[PDB]
Write a protein that binds this ligand. Structure first.
Ligand code: MAN
Ligand code: MAN
Ligand code: MAN
Ligand code: MAN
Lengths: 302, 302, 302, 296
């Protein structure tokens, strides 16, 4: 089946003690290949990302690489906690580029009352200067992204009304309609508790290739793969039974949150997918998948 | 009760990003007052000391102060990871001075196989140039120090066969005998999981004043105090029920490990004890106790 | 007439202790406005750039700003000392963008024998990944740049055969011809010892606007302005008598070399020129000139 | 003749860009061997030490070494500019240890009026905590040190009423008497313009070994050596004609002040003298002399 291949046993990005905003953890990064470079917009916290460590604030960093392994990083966050909806910061960004514009969906965590987090949108032409567009869906939700192109003249988003992956459609990026669930947890498996997107889906000749995450009943996080129909991505063509990535290395199994691999970004250079993922909500790693290796079992049964 | 009094709300020593060896954390320092100055031999790490990626290394720095609050620091470690037993460095030093010689016990962490850490001894005449004397006890152990004077013509050491404070005796500083436990955890209290020495004990008219640490069942670290008989320090005269120091300030409650105060050093100037402690395995603070405020309840009953 | 206006009394970029490559000095930066951002490719040294001990090495950093005053910076150099011609590093880069490609001329300092420095060229599409094209002129020379457009179908460069600004022409960026001097020092003035370009010239309706530097007989460095004919930039239309910028602030007057302002970069946003300059070969500042304020004295007489 | 031997072509101590107080120059250091270590109390400036660079302030740093070559350094100065006599800082310290106490003479530079500099004294038990004792001689003077032992029950100092090395005597370190010149410049030589002590003198079986400095008529600084009588150090028993050290390395010939070697410290371990010197008032080097090679 499909399995992501780690390039080494070492993270590609680690917290940096010198800078308070990224002193504890860097994880769950957006990623895109553009103009001959890999770019990360990474989630960073000052404190370990759980209440037992403290009142962490998530901010978004920028890193850049020629090879997708060795990164340079900017000294200050490119987005910081600047609104009420973002009092506790910005989480788990997903980025696509459409017609010259980068569209980032992230979760603004306000923590002012129960379930005070929202999918928010920001745009950029350059990945450094971000313009907030505000809340996308006025409801507790997260794990959101646009598709990287319009389909049938509409913007399409993925979201996560608990505990399923949902899709929705928009003409104007402000009003969303035709909400429906497209992927659900499966009882008594590695993907029983909840599912959500990983990074944004990638267009393939055979359909939309979507990496997803799931948690089991022991709260272990793994990645999986699903293929969606090109014209109607609400239709699942295939869903791989087995995970494509699971916690194996020491820094995936242990850290601020044990036994987590979690992706918000998949960059493509020359038909190789570079899947960036958080390990234990502490560091960032990379694992690859060649596009020619995207193969699902063909079957037909109700 | 005995309570340590913080000398300020700010650390007295913090990590320094420009020096790799102390970039992440400085904590758990030895301390001694000598020749009109306070001297720290501090534990320092290059990456967070709970990191599950890479291989953090502990090295020993030197700092010096006229007032016990405001420190100057040397730019390079006075002991670095130079033997196999110290591949991952030197931890949690405790120092005493006997007859012109400084005796430092530290934990050498090799990590070459299961439980590869050992109490090790180094000596110096000047606190800068250290001569390794090798492993003290050939067994997994830590939290060790000499007493600062011979007792009945013998050297006495404290150690920590799990989970109790132990003592032992030596005529030649090489062979240790009459090992016995002297202090144990108390169930259902702040000191239930484990106990260990803080810094080396301090001689008083009423007995040996020994600061100890303990962890509770949620791994919160606090300091306590016990008074041992002068001639036979295996005999506990009094043990304070309540802690003398617990995590309260932000940098004691939050850092690389939450809710830790941890001491390896207590310097004495003019009948005031300066207790140096790590906060959250991240920074170093100081709190005082005047000798006249060392008050315990004595008893006479089986 | 023309005077640059400082945007701040503080540097916009300073050396950073934590990073050895830029520990001592950041100065003499290239600059360009692109894709809604100001970008600096800055000269940095590990030790003072006038040190007579050791061997200072110049490497090239990257910084980026939305407003041209407040910069973010990458943690590693985008070009380091990687050839024999660059044993002592890369100096005083000038950048232009032509048809999607950035062309950087810098001085490679080898110091292997007498006068071992050369104008070298590197190209990039993104300002991060630089491809060396090698030595431009096989002779001791410096203070070089392309013009930001071809003229009459040719590439044009400025250089500095001592002590004058020179121009030369090329069809292929490898072979240069029609070398001629275009600007000379003026005896008994602030610009008596030597002249050289500042940043690359900027096209205006009235001609090429070229900031230049000069040294006086006491080695004080100031900036001036000259206007060159559009079609034949060897012809000077006007040269301002007085400097446009001179050392005034404390960090321009004092540092590793006293009384120096020195520019290698002039970014343009919305008809305002942002002139980045080194102060005292130690830090980087910014001063502006609106295009409408480019006014020279003209006359008509033999 | 006596020649100091450099141990390498590299400084032992250089300015540190991270710390403003020592960003430009470290030079002209005191030195002593004590308790198994070499200790430097070094002059440091924030700006090159000439008015053409700016209003430099001299402060005193601490460094320490096991081998006399490879130093560790403290992050802040052990003495900073804290009196009016020291507005522009503390210069060119010389240290001796007598009966458990370190005695440092330095120049306090106030620059408040013409010739506003004074020999000042500070003491310490540990080289870190310094107690000022104030101005030693109320006159423009510098290049001062105690001898490292009392002689005939008196403290003895060297000083520099311009342009000669002087000696003086004291019972109490406050009142100085029996001032006399002991060493003068020699016209038309490398030592024509002025002379001054280097580090404090060192006792030998043959007399007090004193390194001195001199400037020539082009302001080039070199070191020389003299031998003084043990009981009466006002009597010069030998003075070497040729210098023992002169600017040769690039960082001795060029820097903030060209063509300078200048010593304020000479540490002794196992019969070898380690002579620490400023090069070009910018960096610190070391050159050695074995005791058995002190031959006039
Ligand atoms: O901790 C595991 C996982 O839980 C969250 O809720 C996710 O959205 C991620 O932010 C994180 O990696
Ligand atoms: O992390 C808390 C505490 O646990 C360790 O095991 C101790 O020995 C100290 O090194 C440390 O401060
Ligand atoms: O030092 C002043 C000035 O002199 C050099 O030669 C120039 O090329 C610049 O590198 C520098 O700013
Ligand atoms: O500059 C050479 C020399 O001149 C000064 O006056 C001396 O006292 C030293 O401070 C210095 O090294």
């Amino acid at each position: 089946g499909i399995k992501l291949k780690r390039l080494s046993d070492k993270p590609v990005l680690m917290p940096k003690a010198e800078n308070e905003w990224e002193r504890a953890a860097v994880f769950n990064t957006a990623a895109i290949y553009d103009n001959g470079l890999f770019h990360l917009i990474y989630r960073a916290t000052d404190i370990g990302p759980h209440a037992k460590y403290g009142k962490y604030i998530s901010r978004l960093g920028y890193a850049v690489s020629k090879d997708g392994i060795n990164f340079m990083r900017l000294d200050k966050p490119v987005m910081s906690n600047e609104t009420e909806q973002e009092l506790r910061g910005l989480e788990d960004p997903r980025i696509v580029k459409i017609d010259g514009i980068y569209y980032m969906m992230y979760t603004g965590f306000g923590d002012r009352f129960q379930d005070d987090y929202r999918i928010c949108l920001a745009t950029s032409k350059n990945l450094i200067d971000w313009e907030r567009k505000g809340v996308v869906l006025d409801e507790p939700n997260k794990d959101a992204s646009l598709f990287p192109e319009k389909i049938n003249g509409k913007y399409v988003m993925l979201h996560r009304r608990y505990p399923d992956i949902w899709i929705a459609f928009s003409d104007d990026l402000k009003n969303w309609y035709d909400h429906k669930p497209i992927l659900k947890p499966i009882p008594n498996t590695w993907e029983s508790a909840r599912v959500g997107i990983g990074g944004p889906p990638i267009k393939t000749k055979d359909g939309w290739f979507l990496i997803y995450h799931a948690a089991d009943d022991n709260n272990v996080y793994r990645l999986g793969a699903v293929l969606l129909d090109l014209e109607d991505p609400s239709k699942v063509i295939a869903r791989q039974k087995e995970p494509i990535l699971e916690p194996e290395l020491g820094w995936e199994k242990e850290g601020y949150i044990p036994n987590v691999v979690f992706s918000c970004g998949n960059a493509v250079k020359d038909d190789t997918i570079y899947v960036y993922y958080g390990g234990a909500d502490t560091v960032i790693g990379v694992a690859i998948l060649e596009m020619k290796d995207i193969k699902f079992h063909h079957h037909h049964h109700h």
